[PDB]
Amino acid sequence: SPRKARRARLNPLVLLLDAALTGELEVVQQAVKEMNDPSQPNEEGITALHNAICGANYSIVDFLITAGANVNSPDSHGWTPLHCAASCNDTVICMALVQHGAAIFATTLSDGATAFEKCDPYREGYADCATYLADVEQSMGLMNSGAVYALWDYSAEFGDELSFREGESVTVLRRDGPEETDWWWAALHGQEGYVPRNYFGLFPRVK
């Protein structure tokens, strides 16, 4: 059952997404080498990683992450790979994503929810997944000496805000600051300022 050249008139991205959804690893492997960007989305913002997650294809997910697939790419509705993993209550995938640069506080375009809030209480594994994500959220600015990793470059909009580049480590000084629920007082190279929570991961992206 090796991989083979597709029928000439079929769209390769479509075959990629189906293979990621059903579980055909070699096909995914072939597509990834041929395409320029393993994070290539269709018209709906859906990427191979999104489908691998929903299909519970652990082998394909690891391959894609290791290959550099954008673990934070949002679809047309603002759902990132972490949001999909949570809605399936798949703790193992959530962990793999978190450990490779997932933005814990990213929110969807629809209903503006975080991954934690997308856990499905109607499906099995709900308690375990929600608890993990809740612990992940609480450990930020506390664990690893209070350090979090920027997942994107950010240019301060105000002097009281902090500028930073993708991949840099930021220390969270004030987390539960009441005056700002979506920002944290932080430190980068001796400078102190506010930074948006959704720009950070517990771990850095795979470069």
Could you tell me how many residues make up the chain? 207
Q: What is the CA radius of gyration of the chain?
A: 18
Indicate the residue type of 170: V
Look at residues 151, 53, 54 and name the one whose alpha carbon lies nearest to residue 96. 53
- DSSP string of the chain, one letter each residue: ----PPPTTS-HHHHHHHHHHHT-HHHHHHHHHHSS-TT---TTS--HHHHHHHTT-HHHHHHHHHTT--TT---TT---HHHHHHHTT-HHHHHHHHTTT--TT---SSTT--TGGG--TTSTTHHHHHHHHHHHHHHTTTSGGGEEEESS-B--SSTTB--B-TT-EEEEEESS-TT-SSEEEEEETTEEEEEEGGGEESS----
Is 98 in contact with 202 (CB distance < 8 Å)?
yes
Is 38 in contact with 71 (CB distance < 8 Å)?
no
What's the CA angle centered on 49, arms 47 and 53, to 5 degrees?
Answer: 125
C-alpha distance from residue 44 to each of 18, 103, 138 (Å): 14, 20, 32
Taking the C-alpha atoms of residue 157 and residue 54, their distance in angstroms, rounded to an integer, is: 37
Look at residues 128, 115, 130 and name the one whose alpha carbon lies nearest to residue 201. 115
Question: Which residue matches tokens 């979506």?
Answer: 182
What residues contact residue 87 under an 8 Å CB cut-off, 6+ apart? 118, 119, 120
CATH topology of domain 1-207: 1.25.40
Please state the φ and ψ torsions of residue 40, each to the nearest 5 degrees: -55, 120
Taking the C-alpha atoms of residue 55 and residue 127, their distance in angstroms, rounded to an integer, is: 20
Taking the C-alpha atoms of residue 168 and residue 101, their distance in angstroms, rounded to an integer, is: 12
Q: Pairing between strand 191-196 and 183-188?
A: antiparallel
Name the experimental technique.
X-ray
Look at residues 103, 107, 93 and name the one whose alpha carbon lies nearest to residue 64. 93
The residues facing 191 across adjacent strands are: 188
Taking the C-alpha atoms of residue 165 and residue 172, their distance in angstroms, rounded to an integer, is: 16
Q: Is the dihedral of CA 86, 91, 97, 103 positive or negative?
A: positive
Please state the φ and ψ torsions of residue 19, each to the nearest 5 degrees: -60, -35
What residues contact residue 30 under an 8 Å CB cut-off, 6+ apart? 3
Taking the C-alpha atoms of residue 79 and residue 117, their distance in angstroms, rounded to an integer, is: 12
